[PDB]
Amino acid sequence: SIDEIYKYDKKQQQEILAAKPWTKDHHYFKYCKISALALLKMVMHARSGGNLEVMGLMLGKVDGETMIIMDSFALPVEGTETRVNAQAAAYEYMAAYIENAKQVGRLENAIGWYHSHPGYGCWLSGIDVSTQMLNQQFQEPFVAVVIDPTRTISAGKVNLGAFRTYPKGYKPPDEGPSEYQTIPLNKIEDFGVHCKQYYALEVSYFKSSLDRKLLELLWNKYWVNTLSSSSLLTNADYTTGQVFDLSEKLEQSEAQLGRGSEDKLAKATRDSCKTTIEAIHGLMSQVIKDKLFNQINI
Amino acid sequence: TGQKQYNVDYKLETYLKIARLYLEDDDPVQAEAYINRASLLQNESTNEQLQIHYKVCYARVLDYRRKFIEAAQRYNELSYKTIVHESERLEALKHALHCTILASAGQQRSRMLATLFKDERCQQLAAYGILEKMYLD
Amino acid sequence: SVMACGVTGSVSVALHPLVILNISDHWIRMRSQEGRPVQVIGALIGKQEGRNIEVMNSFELLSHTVEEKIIIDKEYYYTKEEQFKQVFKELEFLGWYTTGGPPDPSDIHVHKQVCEIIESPLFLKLNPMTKHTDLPVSVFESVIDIINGEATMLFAELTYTLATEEAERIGVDHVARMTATGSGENSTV
């Protein structure tokens, strides 16, 4: 039975809460299972606001080293990324939402907070790290999630991240590859400083029996939306912007060759591909359609 | 004002007929005055047809005073009552249609117009060619 | 029978899959709570412009039972009406949902309680353990005709076009089609 996870054992939670394998090992939690609903609503919350970062709250539970996220919702706050802990404005709508939600079915407890990062990867800024450190300080099992809606679109797949911060004192172990994503230079500094102070979590996605069976029945009529998709005028103001970012990254490495952070043409080359790889992939689905619907004759 | 005292079904019927007559000569300045005095004694009645002929005559006081959108709510209500005979629910529904159309473009009016296309009884009405074309823009 | 069957039309409806999943999570979770199938009930919200109606998101509502009649605790709706107007300030109240068979008397009594709140309440119903090879999610509305000298409520059924949002579409494409160790050499194409 797939619905092993949509079950919620409440007494098991409060035994782990008391036991605490997180006060013993600093990097205990390493995995993160994201539900069907949780993914959709978080992606929907990020894009709905769009250009502006907005954060909400996640609900979930713990199991082994996996911090499972079951359900999510929004926090009507402002100044995400510009304020350290911007959720303080609506302390009312955190507890008041879970008090209402527990009457109707959502028994799940506070598991974390998520925010959107439109057009610049998934990572924790210096403002985000100060939020999460103090979140872990008091309100324990709390995981900071990030999603990039504008690139999720252009890249053509779920652009998402799940992170946890380390203590101010103890410093991380060695094993860390960490994959590269284009960071706009305006932000590269902020990232660059506080980037090594935290560690990510291995993301995995699950679903129920009904969800799985519904999505299969849903696909009978959803193939139509795939071949009238067109990721061009949808996210037009990411690709047109990335150019502005790309231009600056070259401008630096050009003068770097001259008189005068290690070969910033190798980054810019990867960015020029990254951004254009998308632009080309876009025109694949376009010609695919011109082939299909236009070329039948009468 | 008289020395003698009278019942509910006489006073509520008298102010009904007074207000109904001043409208028939086109004079809602007078018709509004007595139907206001009729409203005092309509809560007090247990008569199930006299209260009905008050709402038919109060819908018309809002009609002749050019409150067309609120008039549509009175007329529409009366066509849904079964106690009113079937041939009289046709007029009840049709007076709502006219006052729903001739009212100013309210958002309340858009929900009335929706109720008017949803109701198959309205298809029978002569201004369906207007309504069909009105509600659906 | 207590549904309409006539020359319908009226409004044109769209449907976001997020709504389907929020009900699906709500059914499985309340089913799991009691160890049996459950008729869960909740509220619908989204954009309303002119005739056309889009359902964007959905949440839950509190319900009780006076005898055999399902009572929507409205004091809960007005409380959640606060909190949903906060986060999605643009969005409007549209209708409600439930699970089970097709439309029936127990939902007509509930439809009356939603009719006190708004003048055009939509109604979705989902069959969880469906025998249909097609989708078991159909949308309806309130219609009223003369049933032999009796003005009375009915359900006129309507169709539903699916939602398109590019950001959302990927969410569907990710969980309905999972990369569970199915890409080694990047490839990209």
Ligand SMILES: [Zn+2]
């Ligand atoms: Zn951030």
